[PDB]
RNA sequence: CUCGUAGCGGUUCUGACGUGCAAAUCGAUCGUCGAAUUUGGGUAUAGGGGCGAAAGACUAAUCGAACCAUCUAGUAGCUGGUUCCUGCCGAAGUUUCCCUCAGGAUAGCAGAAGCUCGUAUCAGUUUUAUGAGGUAAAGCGAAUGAUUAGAGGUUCCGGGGUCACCUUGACCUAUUCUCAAACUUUAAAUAUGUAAGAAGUCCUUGUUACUUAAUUGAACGUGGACAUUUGAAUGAAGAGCUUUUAGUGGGCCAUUUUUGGUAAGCAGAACUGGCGAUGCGGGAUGAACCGAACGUAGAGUUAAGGUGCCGGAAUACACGCU
RNA sequence: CUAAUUAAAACAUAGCAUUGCGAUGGUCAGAAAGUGAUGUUGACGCAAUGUGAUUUCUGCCCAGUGCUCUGAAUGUCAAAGUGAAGAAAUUCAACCAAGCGCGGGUAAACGGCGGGAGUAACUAUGACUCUCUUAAGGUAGCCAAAUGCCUCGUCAUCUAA
RNA sequence: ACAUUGUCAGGUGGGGAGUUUGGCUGGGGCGGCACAUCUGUUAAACGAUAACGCAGAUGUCCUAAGGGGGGCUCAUGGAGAACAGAAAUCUCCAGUAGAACAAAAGGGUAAAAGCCCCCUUGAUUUUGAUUUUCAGUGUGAAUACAAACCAUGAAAGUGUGGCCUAUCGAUCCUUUAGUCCCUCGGAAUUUGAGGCUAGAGGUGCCAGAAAAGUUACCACAGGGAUAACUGGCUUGUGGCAGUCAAGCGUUCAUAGCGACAUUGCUUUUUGAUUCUUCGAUGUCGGCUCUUCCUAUCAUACCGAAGCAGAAUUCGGUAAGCG
RNA sequence: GGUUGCGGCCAUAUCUACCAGAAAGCACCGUUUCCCGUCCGAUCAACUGUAGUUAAGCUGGUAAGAGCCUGACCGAGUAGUGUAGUGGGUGACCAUACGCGAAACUCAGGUGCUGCAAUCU
């Protein structure tokens, strides 16, 4: 038998029961979709900086 | 039946804004975008490549990636009861800088400048913004300003 | 759909690894070949009493198949497969579009 | 074999016009919208009387005919058919549908009606000042063919124009007024003086 | 063959009876009554079988597949029922998929168990700055499409009317009346994105295989300067995170915006509040309206609604109208 | 005859007709059998059907479907068998019975049995004619019939209606 | 030495056996597809949003209609040229697109994305990321890069199909391509087979069973989630009233009427709906018998008449009585 | 300040009509062997700044010009609209309260500004 197709009634009250969450940002996001050539050079630019701060202090 | 294509309900959104059709002016292609800049999204209807979905019109996000002709943009989208990060691959004619991030950076520079003139002398310079305040005491003169006004007006039809 | 019977395309030949000339033909499937393991299992399952044991498809809806081009490299004799969209007609020979010319029939 | 007008009295729908999607709309039976001495000069008919709607409703084209004929015939009989000018100022552009038992119940076009507001003129008449009682009586006779409430307002404008009677006299005993066939043209302070001399000689004195 | 007893049936009363005398009888009226008659006993045919002058009839009150026992406590998305108290928290009728539509899975809502930390971490809110939108309105002497009336301009664009003439189709020009869910130059209100900093800002110089004509940039860095008015408001009820699982997946009503329909206590959407799941005071009465949400009491004040009497509270006071 | 709601117009019947079968057979049983029913039978018989006394008649159609036919024997064709190639499993090829295909017969087999136009010295009516498709185009008869929707058809009769 | 009998093989075989005979749905069936989709609108200016809502469209087509480059500008009009006129060609002027871009509709596009020419295969290879549908699964489609190899152009650049928004498909099985790679488990060689990676063959009910009917002889589980009859809401339709008065009524709107319009009432018609009842509210009509309503046919008393009488017609109080 | 080359914002720059432009530049203009391109050296290509010219282009100005742009306590706090009431009205709708707030219209003003390089009485 015919019934109720669709409604958005009560859905915002359900979403605000736990009160819509912001996704909790961090320092250093991931490199997901960051350009691969930049990533390849970033690897070596951080390798050399690890060695530079190693030799600076020892 | 029903229709939910990629550019459905975009009759007016991707229209090209009276007497501004045709070629895109060149400052659009010479603006420089760094990773971390806050950009606005408004799709040009005349360029069909790199084109954002209609959800992202009027949305404002952060550049995470820079490519040959395009930038990637982080946009927070409200899926159900939480926010999901969306990564967008948009060409730079669908992208413009946010003027809010201009205005806040001159406020940062003004804050540093007045803190320097407070360090020179006169500490506690009170450098936060304030909301609009209730007005102070005035004295209103009646000099060439004698308060003269009539009454409400009678009804006439003037048809 | 008219496709030329020769194509200058990439080769995964490992002594080509570059764009070479390819002879283009169509892919037809091949004989179903008894002693394939599914055919052996199917004959054993259909053996005896019990009737038909696997589903026999009836409710077909497509009137087209996808055209599969068989790209044979003229240099190293290695082959490749390309799929085209649904077409009701597929040619391989000539008769290019002579454009600026009055109609026939 | 026609639904009573209380079925289609109120503006309950979005305006459904005859378009490239409608395509099968029966003709409006009101086809004449100016009556009387329509060719008359603006100076001929200074007094304007308006029949004005007080309600937000729909007027059927049948009712528009039925009121136009009654007002026209009373004014023709009592005052002569070349002593007034009558204008129907609403046009039945909205298509009323009829569904002739609820599956697939979208309606086919029944007729044509005119969507009126509070304060729209339905009928405007211009006459001489001496014809006022006949025109008011003709419009009050035409009230009975329309549902809802309608007021008879005497306009403070000269004729069918959009400026006051002393303002129009100040404009025509000066030189900013020249005749058209049934309406009038006004002289502006803007435009080429060669064209504003080509028309309007009688100004610039 | 016939009328008609016995017999054998079973027409009609649609009689009686209809918790009967009776799980099919009683009475009257009827059909037939010497044979395809009626009947006893013996015998044969047994369940997907028999037997049938055929009604799916009959086969032990059982027949469109008897009866008995077992498999078997067959299966049921369907219906009923489901047993002590008190406390604390507390829903959903919505998303996606399904031979899915009386059912499931899945997400959400809900409880529990907590874990990591301890002041602002954040917020169904405002402000300021900055975006985005094409709905209401508006417009049509702006485009597209409709649409009313005239005027001006001479033509083998097949008007007859001289072979340049009152009575010309249009077309253009300037006006005029009126409109549009699938029209629009313009364009709100409400709703909506971002930002309002210590992961911040400046100064100097380290990395690299990316980038540049070029340490030019890019990204990440070292070292240094800036101390809570550290960068609007108000609040924060602690904040953040994890696992697990119940029920639900028929909804309905009101205000506003809406679609179809003449309409409906009709059918279907949008936002919020409610009922469901909820008593209390008021609307006589009532799921939803107004008011207000509830431990047990006491006192006081109220809301909504009232104050002739039923009925607690002024047959108050006042200006009129009927 | 539907025991216990239907006694009939239903079923049966005589009559009529069709079909199969001459016995190492027809039709039908049985798990099998050195087994059975018809059959202690033999075509005036057994078996399967349809129609349903008498009278009078039973029209046309073999396209469809069924049934049937010493009917055509390189169309299709399985297993075995044959040939080739292969190391062999195997693959390929030729042959390939019945059946189907082809052709014929058969309606007291199942069944089926049309539209329009132009036409008579009337106006419509249409002996006749023409194409449109058919396998044939509903014949003799009968009928608003227990079969006719429209329909309570039209006329007559029966009645005051 | 054929029958017979045994085994296997092909045919025939509703005689019999088993099973199936989608869904949505203003009840169901028929119809349609609102079942996978695309454009505009509905849709209430973020997004999302329903109905068997409205107007349409998809299961294709294209070796160019894909890619790159270059030159040019289109529709339409006007003014001119032998045939030649409204339409054939040629020339000039105007022309913001009023053209074209495969196919719906919307968006977009003018030294172009249109038209014409030149060169081509980037409609290629590898495997990730992202967007939209969304559960942030799949599939389809799209975006931006990276590693190659190319095309094109002088080049910057562009090109991972079609200017963008539709144009499509799991597991199992079969087949092909790829390395010449793994395995056949006592050790080998060679066939065969199995495997790994990538496509195809197809599920349109489009997240994908292998599927005809009928039941009036019927059965069960249920369902007032849902029809048939009362009631309830509504009142299109039916019925009954009113206003206005063109006109009829020998002159004369209104004695009686009354067009074109328009406002109502009723619930004795029929639709509309599906709220109540499916662990049953006895379903048509007649007979009998009571009461009630009034929108009065008769009877009582009146008013009006195109009421002379007679007979009528309109109207009032009135349901007492027939 | 003119002009050129390359621009930015893309009409305050466009459009219609008329009138001026010294100097330099730009331009029209002159020639066809060569590279190249056409049916046509018209366009494209090459060569000479020579034979000539400001006629056009181009620039600037004028116009109670069209358009465009800006502003206005001009319309107008109008239309619309968020919130509220056991407000009004049979209804259609409307008023009030606390807020936000258009468009057409009507007036007035304006009619390109500017970056890099080079050149010029
Ligand atoms: Mg159903
Ligand atoms: Mg539901
Ligand atoms: Mg809602
Ligand atoms: Mg909740
Ligand atoms: Mg939620
Ligand atoms: Mg769409
Ligand atoms: Mg669009
Ligand atoms: Mg826009
Ligand atoms: Mg593309
Ligand atoms: Mg296999
Ligand atoms: Mg086995
Ligand atoms: Mg296919
Ligand atoms: Mg009616
Ligand atoms: Mg409506
Ligand atoms: Mg009225
Ligand atoms: Mg006898
Ligand atoms: Mg007898
Ligand atoms: Mg008896
Ligand atoms: Mg009895
Ligand atoms: Mg008897
Ligand atoms: Mg008898
Ligand atoms: Mg007898
Ligand atoms: Mg006897
Ligand atoms: Mg006898
Ligand atoms: Mg015995
Ligand atoms: Mg027996
Ligand atoms: Mg059995
Ligand atoms: Mg029985
Ligand atoms: Mg039993
Ligand atoms: Mg059990
Ligand atoms: Mg029970
Ligand atoms: Mg609680
Ligand atoms: Mg259930
Ligand atoms: Mg239930
Ligand atoms: Mg869950
Ligand atoms: Mg919870
Ligand atoms: Mg709009
Ligand atoms: Mg819209
Ligand atoms: Mg609005
Ligand atoms: Mg509007
Ligand atoms: Mg217009
Ligand atoms: Mg709308
Ligand atoms: Mg608009
Ligand atoms: Mg804040
Ligand atoms: Mg739980
Ligand atoms: Mg349910
Ligand atoms: Mg409802
Ligand atoms: Mg419940
Ligand atoms: Mg409550
Ligand atoms: Mg109350
Ligand atoms: Mg109460
Ligand atoms: Mg009450
Ligand atoms: Mg309230
Ligand atoms: Mg309480
Ligand atoms: Mg008291
Ligand atoms: Mg019995
Ligand atoms: Mg009986
Ligand atoms: Mg009998
Ligand atoms: Mg009986
Ligand atoms: Mg019988
Ligand atoms: Mg015997
Ligand atoms: Mg008989
Ligand atoms: Mg007979
Ligand atoms: Mg035959
Ligand atoms: Mg063989
Ligand atoms: Mg034959
Ligand atoms: Mg014969
Ligand atoms: Mg016979
Ligand atoms: Mg027949
Ligand atoms: Mg006959
Ligand atoms: Mg007959
Ligand atoms: Mg009869
Ligand atoms: Mg009869
Ligand atoms: Mg033998
Ligand atoms: Mg045998
Ligand atoms: Mg079989
Ligand atoms: Mg069978
Ligand atoms: Mg069967
Ligand atoms: Mg239905
Ligand atoms: Mg159907
Ligand atoms: Mg649906
Ligand atoms: Mg889906
Ligand atoms: Mg909205
Ligand atoms: Mg939207
Ligand atoms: Mg609609
Ligand atoms: Mg729909
Ligand atoms: Mg489709
Ligand atoms: Mg080009
Ligand atoms: Mg095509
Ligand atoms: Mg998904
Ligand atoms: Mg998931
Ligand atoms: Mg798709
Ligand atoms: Mg693509
Ligand atoms: Mg590339
Ligand atoms: Mg593609
Ligand atoms: Mg592409
Ligand atoms: Mg294409
Ligand atoms: Mg193209
Ligand atoms: Mg499987
Ligand atoms: Mg395999
Ligand atoms: Mg091994
Ligand atoms: Mg080993
Ligand atoms: Mg072994
Ligand atoms: Mg080995
Ligand atoms: Mg092998
Ligand atoms: Mg193999
Ligand atoms: Mg691959
Ligand atoms: Mg496939
Ligand atoms: Mg599906
Ligand atoms: Mg699906
Ligand atoms: Mg039952
Ligand atoms: Mg119900
Ligand atoms: Mg109704
Ligand atoms: Mg009614
Ligand atoms: Mg009615
Ligand atoms: Mg009335
Ligand atoms: Mg009279
Ligand atoms: Mg019950
Ligand atoms: Mg009863
Ligand atoms: Mg009365
Ligand atoms: Mg009376
Ligand atoms: Mg009497
Ligand atoms: Mg009485
Ligand atoms: Mg009485
Ligand atoms: Mg030259
Ligand atoms: Zn190769």
mmCIF file of N, CA, C and O (backbone and C1' of nucleotides) in Angstrom, chain F residues 74-103:
data_model
loop_
_atom_site.group_PDB
_atom_site.id
_atom_site.type_symbol
_atom_site.label_atom_id
_atom_site.label_comp_id
_atom_site.label_asym_id
_atom_site.label_seq_id
_atom_site.Cartn_x
_atom_site.Cartn_y
_atom_site.Cartn_z
ATOM 1 P P U F 74 20.145 -38.876 -51.884
ATOM 2 O "O5'" U F 74 20.582 -37.428 -51.380
ATOM 3 C "C5'" U F 74 20.042 -36.888 -50.176
ATOM 4 C "C4'" U F 74 20.983 -35.927 -49.481
ATOM 5 C "C3'" U F 74 21.616 -34.845 -50.357
ATOM 6 O "O3'" U F 74 21.702 -33.634 -49.614
ATOM 7 C "C1'" U F 74 23.316 -36.099 -49.291
ATOM 8 P P G F 75 20.965 -32.316 -50.153
ATOM 9 O "O5'" G F 75 20.356 -31.660 -48.839
ATOM 10 C "C5'" G F 75 21.095 -31.628 -47.627
ATOM 11 C "C4'" G F 75 20.372 -30.815 -46.588
ATOM 12 C "C3'" G F 75 20.712 -31.126 -45.140
ATOM 13 O "O3'" G F 75 21.871 -30.439 -44.698
ATOM 14 C "C1'" G F 75 18.364 -31.043 -45.417
ATOM 15 P P U F 76 22.975 -31.181 -43.798
ATOM 16 O "O5'" U F 76 22.312 -31.249 -42.354
ATOM 17 C "C5'" U F 76 21.893 -30.066 -41.693
ATOM 18 C "C4'" U F 76 20.992 -30.381 -40.528
ATOM 19 C "C3'" U F 76 21.501 -31.444 -39.573
ATOM 20 O "O3'" U F 76 22.481 -30.963 -38.671
ATOM 21 C "C1'" U F 76 19.222 -31.841 -40.066
ATOM 22 P P C F 77 23.913 -31.689 -38.588
ATOM 23 O "O5'" C F 77 23.640 -32.962 -37.677
ATOM 24 C "C5'" C F 77 23.003 -32.820 -36.418
ATOM 25 C "C4'" C F 77 22.325 -34.093 -35.988
ATOM 26 C "C3'" C F 77 23.211 -35.310 -35.826
ATOM 27 O "O3'" C F 77 23.952 -35.292 -34.624
ATOM 28 C "C1'" C F 77 21.219 -35.919 -36.942
ATOM 29 P P A F 78 25.422 -35.931 -34.575
ATOM 30 O "O5'" A F 78 25.542 -36.448 -33.083
ATOM 31 C "C5'" A F 78 24.659 -35.975 -32.079
ATOM 32 C "C4'" A F 78 24.281 -37.082 -31.141
ATOM 33 C "C3'" A F 78 25.294 -38.202 -31.016
ATOM 34 O "O3'" A F 78 26.383 -37.885 -30.171
ATOM 35 C "C1'" A F 78 23.144 -39.119 -31.268
ATOM 36 P P A F 79 27.827 -38.516 -30.455
ATOM 37 O "O5'" A F 79 27.710 -40.006 -29.920
ATOM 38 C "C5'" A F 79 27.476 -40.271 -28.545
ATOM 39 C "C4'" A F 79 27.080 -41.705 -28.330
ATOM 40 C "C3'" A F 79 27.992 -42.741 -28.956
ATOM 41 O "O3'" A F 79 29.165 -42.986 -28.207
ATOM 42 C "C1'" A F 79 25.774 -43.255 -29.497
ATOM 43 P P A F 80 30.590 -43.028 -28.939
ATOM 44 O "O5'" A F 80 30.634 -44.468 -29.610
ATOM 45 C "C5'" A F 80 30.497 -45.640 -28.826
ATOM 46 C "C4'" A F 80 30.063 -46.813 -29.663
ATOM 47 C "C3'" A F 80 30.991 -47.204 -30.798
ATOM 48 O "O3'" A F 80 32.086 -47.997 -30.368
ATOM 49 C "C1'" A F 80 28.778 -47.121 -31.596
ATOM 50 P P G F 81 33.568 -47.687 -30.900
ATOM 51 O "O5'" G F 81 33.490 -47.993 -32.456
ATOM 52 C "C5'" G F 81 33.277 -49.310 -32.937
ATOM 53 C "C4'" G F 81 32.867 -49.295 -34.385
ATOM 54 C "C3'" G F 81 33.851 -48.639 -35.335
ATOM 55 O "O3'" G F 81 34.899 -49.507 -35.720
ATOM 56 C "C1'" G F 81 31.695 -47.787 -35.746
ATOM 57 P P U F 82 36.370 -48.928 -35.982
ATOM 58 O "O5'" U F 82 36.207 -48.078 -37.316
ATOM 59 C "C5'" U F 82 35.997 -48.722 -38.565
ATOM 60 C "C4'" U F 82 35.911 -47.724 -39.689
ATOM 61 C "C3'" U F 82 37.133 -46.843 -39.883
ATOM 62 O "O3'" U F 82 38.146 -47.489 -40.636
ATOM 63 C "C1'" U F 82 35.173 -45.513 -39.926
ATOM 64 P P G F 83 39.696 -47.138 -40.408
ATOM 65 O "O5'" G F 83 39.854 -45.671 -40.991
ATOM 66 C "C5'" G F 83 39.872 -45.450 -42.390
ATOM 67 C "C4'" G F 83 39.966 -43.986 -42.700
ATOM 68 C "C3'" G F 83 41.146 -43.257 -42.085
ATOM 69 O "O3'" G F 83 42.340 -43.422 -42.829
ATOM 70 C "C1'" G F 83 39.175 -42.005 -41.748
ATOM 71 P P A F 84 43.766 -43.382 -42.095
ATOM 72 O "O5'" A F 84 44.067 -41.829 -41.939
ATOM 73 C "C5'" A F 84 44.111 -40.984 -43.078
ATOM 74 C "C4'" A F 84 44.082 -39.529 -42.691
ATOM 75 C "C3'" A F 84 45.132 -39.088 -41.692
ATOM 76 O "O3'" A F 84 46.389 -38.859 -42.292
ATOM 77 C "C1'" A F 84 43.036 -38.232 -41.046
ATOM 78 P P A F 85 47.732 -39.251 -41.514
ATOM 79 O "O5'" A F 85 48.001 -38.001 -40.553
ATOM 80 C "C5'" A F 85 48.137 -36.702 -41.109
ATOM 81 C "C4'" A F 85 47.959 -35.684 -39.997
ATOM 82 C "C3'" A F 85 48.753 -36.071 -38.762
ATOM 83 O "O3'" A F 85 50.135 -35.699 -38.782
ATOM 84 C "C1'" A F 85 46.542 -35.616 -38.122
ATOM 85 P P G F 86 51.220 -36.661 -38.092
ATOM 86 O "O5'" G F 86 50.991 -36.442 -36.535
ATOM 87 C "C5'" G F 86 51.218 -35.178 -35.938
ATOM 88 C "C4'" G F 86 50.634 -35.110 -34.553
ATOM 89 C "C3'" G F 86 51.130 -36.143 -33.565
ATOM 90 O "O3'" G F 86 52.437 -35.896 -33.083
ATOM 91 C "C1'" G F 86 48.795 -35.984 -33.391
ATOM 92 P P A F 87 53.558 -37.036 -33.232
ATOM 93 O "O5'" A F 87 52.929 -38.273 -32.452
ATOM 94 C "C5'" A F 87 53.642 -39.488 -32.265
ATOM 95 C "C4'" A F 87 53.529 -39.964 -30.838
ATOM 96 C "C3'" A F 87 52.131 -39.905 -30.232
ATOM 97 O "O3'" A F 87 51.391 -41.090 -30.472
ATOM 98 C "C1'" A F 87 53.676 -38.856 -28.777
ATOM 99 P P A F 88 50.071 -41.072 -31.376
ATOM 100 O "O5'" A F 88 48.870 -41.130 -30.337
ATOM 101 C "C5'" A F 88 48.735 -42.202 -29.418
ATOM 102 C "C4'" A F 88 48.423 -41.694 -28.035
ATOM 103 C "C3'" A F 88 47.118 -40.926 -27.874
ATOM 104 O "O3'" A F 88 45.997 -41.772 -27.669
ATOM 105 C "C1'" A F 88 48.882 -39.707 -26.884
ATOM 106 P P A F 89 44.502 -41.263 -27.961
ATOM 107 O "O5'" A F 89 44.130 -40.331 -26.724
ATOM 108 C "C5'" A F 89 43.899 -40.863 -25.427
ATOM 109 C "C4'" A F 89 43.897 -39.774 -24.384
ATOM 110 C "C3'" A F 89 42.777 -38.746 -24.490
ATOM 111 O "O3'" A F 89 41.598 -39.154 -23.811
ATOM 112 C "C1'" A F 89 44.870 -37.645 -24.257
ATOM 113 P P U F 90 40.154 -39.086 -24.512
ATOM 114 O "O5'" U F 90 40.292 -37.947 -25.604
ATOM 115 C "C5'" U F 90 39.750 -36.652 -25.439
ATOM 116 C "C4'" U F 90 40.576 -35.649 -26.199
ATOM 117 C "C3'" U F 90 39.952 -35.049 -27.449
ATOM 118 O "O3'" U F 90 39.080 -33.974 -27.168
ATOM 119 C "C1'" U F 90 42.160 -35.739 -27.920
ATOM 120 P P U F 91 37.704 -33.797 -27.976
ATOM 121 O "O5'" U F 91 38.124 -33.062 -29.319
ATOM 122 C "C5'" U F 91 38.718 -31.777 -29.301
ATOM 123 C "C4'" U F 91 39.453 -31.507 -30.590
ATOM 124 C "C3'" U F 91 38.613 -31.567 -31.855
ATOM 125 O "O3'" U F 91 37.888 -30.374 -32.102
ATOM 126 C "C1'" U F 91 40.605 -32.794 -32.178
ATOM 127 P P C F 92 36.470 -30.433 -32.852
ATOM 128 O "O5'" C F 92 36.829 -30.803 -34.359
ATOM 129 C "C5'" C F 92 37.482 -29.871 -35.206
ATOM 130 C "C4'" C F 92 38.023 -30.534 -36.447
ATOM 131 C "C3'" C F 92 37.000 -31.161 -37.377
ATOM 132 O "O3'" C F 92 36.323 -30.228 -38.202
ATOM 133 C "C1'" C F 92 38.793 -32.662 -37.062
ATOM 134 P P A F 93 34.799 -30.496 -38.632
ATOM 135 O "O5'" A F 93 34.887 -31.707 -39.660
ATOM 136 C "C5'" A F 93 35.498 -31.537 -40.929
ATOM 137 C "C4'" A F 93 35.755 -32.856 -41.613
ATOM 138 C "C3'" A F 93 34.529 -33.662 -41.993
ATOM 139 O "O3'" A F 93 33.903 -33.191 -43.171
ATOM 140 C "C1'" A F 93 36.145 -35.085 -41.024
ATOM 141 P P A F 94 32.305 -33.220 -43.291
ATOM 142 O "O5'" A F 94 31.983 -34.681 -43.831
ATOM 143 C "C5'" A F 94 32.376 -35.081 -45.134
ATOM 144 C "C4'" A F 94 32.534 -36.578 -45.239
ATOM 145 C "C3'" A F 94 31.279 -37.410 -45.052
ATOM 146 O "O3'" A F 94 30.456 -37.458 -46.201
ATOM 147 C "C1'" A F 94 33.022 -38.345 -43.784
ATOM 148 P P C F 95 28.860 -37.353 -46.047
ATOM 149 O "O5'" C F 95 28.439 -38.738 -45.385
ATOM 150 C "C5'" C F 95 28.421 -39.937 -46.146
ATOM 151 C "C4'" C F 95 28.445 -41.165 -45.269
ATOM 152 C "C3'" C F 95 27.168 -41.472 -44.501
ATOM 153 O "O3'" C F 95 26.190 -42.145 -45.274
ATOM 154 C "C1'" C F 95 29.015 -41.620 -43.041
ATOM 155 P P C F 96 24.634 -41.785 -45.097
ATOM 156 O "O5'" C F 96 24.398 -41.772 -43.523
ATOM 157 C "C5'" C F 96 24.086 -42.956 -42.803
ATOM 158 C "C4'" C F 96 23.877 -42.645 -41.344
ATOM 159 C "C3'" C F 96 22.666 -41.781 -41.030
ATOM 160 O "O3'" C F 96 21.464 -42.528 -40.957
ATOM 161 C "C1'" C F 96 24.565 -40.944 -39.882
ATOM 162 P P A F 97 20.330 -42.354 -42.080
ATOM 163 O "O5'" A F 97 19.118 -43.222 -41.537
ATOM 164 C "C5'" A F 97 19.215 -44.634 -41.443
ATOM 165 C "C4'" A F 97 18.470 -45.146 -40.243
ATOM 166 C "C3'" A F 97 17.180 -44.420 -39.918
ATOM 167 O "O3'" A F 97 16.087 -44.840 -40.708
ATOM 168 C "C1'" A F 97 18.440 -44.699 -37.948
ATOM 169 P P A F 98 15.064 -43.748 -41.268
ATOM 170 O "O5'" A F 98 14.150 -43.388 -40.014
ATOM 171 C "C5'" A F 98 13.255 -44.338 -39.455
ATOM 172 C "C4'" A F 98 12.925 -44.031 -38.012
ATOM 173 C "C3'" A F 98 12.190 -42.729 -37.742
ATOM 174 O "O3'" A F 98 10.794 -42.831 -37.957
ATOM 175 C "C1'" A F 98 14.000 -42.913 -36.255
ATOM 176 P P G F 99 9.991 -41.659 -38.706
ATOM 177 O "O5'" G F 99 10.121 -40.403 -37.742
ATOM 178 C "C5'" G F 99 9.485 -40.368 -36.475
ATOM 179 C "C4'" G F 99 10.011 -39.226 -35.642
ATOM 180 C "C3'" G F 99 9.859 -37.842 -36.249
ATOM 181 O "O3'" G F 99 8.577 -37.283 -36.020
ATOM 182 C "C1'" G F 99 12.083 -38.129 -35.518
ATOM 183 P P C F 100 7.804 -36.500 -37.192
ATOM 184 O "O5'" C F 100 8.590 -35.126 -37.336
ATOM 185 C "C5'" C F 100 8.581 -34.167 -36.293
ATOM 186 C "C4'" C F 100 9.661 -33.131 -36.483
ATOM 187 C "C3'" C F 100 9.619 -32.339 -37.779
ATOM 188 O "O3'" C F 100 8.658 -31.298 -37.805
ATOM 189 C "C1'" C F 100 11.814 -33.090 -37.422
ATOM 190 P P G F 101 7.835 -31.014 -39.156
ATOM 191 O "O5'" G F 101 8.939 -30.555 -40.209
ATOM 192 C "C5'" G F 101 9.551 -29.276 -40.134
ATOM 193 C "C4'" G F 101 10.643 -29.130 -41.162
ATOM 194 C "C3'" G F 101 10.208 -29.245 -42.614
ATOM 195 O "O3'" G F 101 9.646 -28.051 -43.134
ATOM 196 C "C1'" G F 101 12.079 -30.621 -42.269
ATOM 197 P P C F 102 8.166 -28.067 -43.761
ATOM 198 O "O5'" C F 102 8.356 -28.671 -45.223
ATOM 199 C "C5'" C F 102 9.405 -28.234 -46.079
ATOM 200 C "C4'" C F 102 9.548 -29.143 -47.276
ATOM 201 C "C3'" C F 102 8.250 -29.557 -47.940
ATOM 202 O "O3'" C F 102 7.717 -28.554 -48.787
ATOM 203 C "C1'" C F 102 9.638 -31.452 -47.683
ATOM 204 P P G F 103 6.140 -28.257 -48.786
ATOM 205 O "O5'" G F 103 5.508 -29.546 -49.471
ATOM 206 C "C5'" G F 103 5.723 -29.809 -50.848
ATOM 207 C "C4'" G F 103 5.336 -31.217 -51.222
ATOM 208 C "C3'" G F 103 3.898 -31.628 -50.962
ATOM 209 O "O3'" G F 103 2.967 -31.132 -51.908
ATOM 210 C "C1'" G F 103 5.332 -33.333 -50.216
#
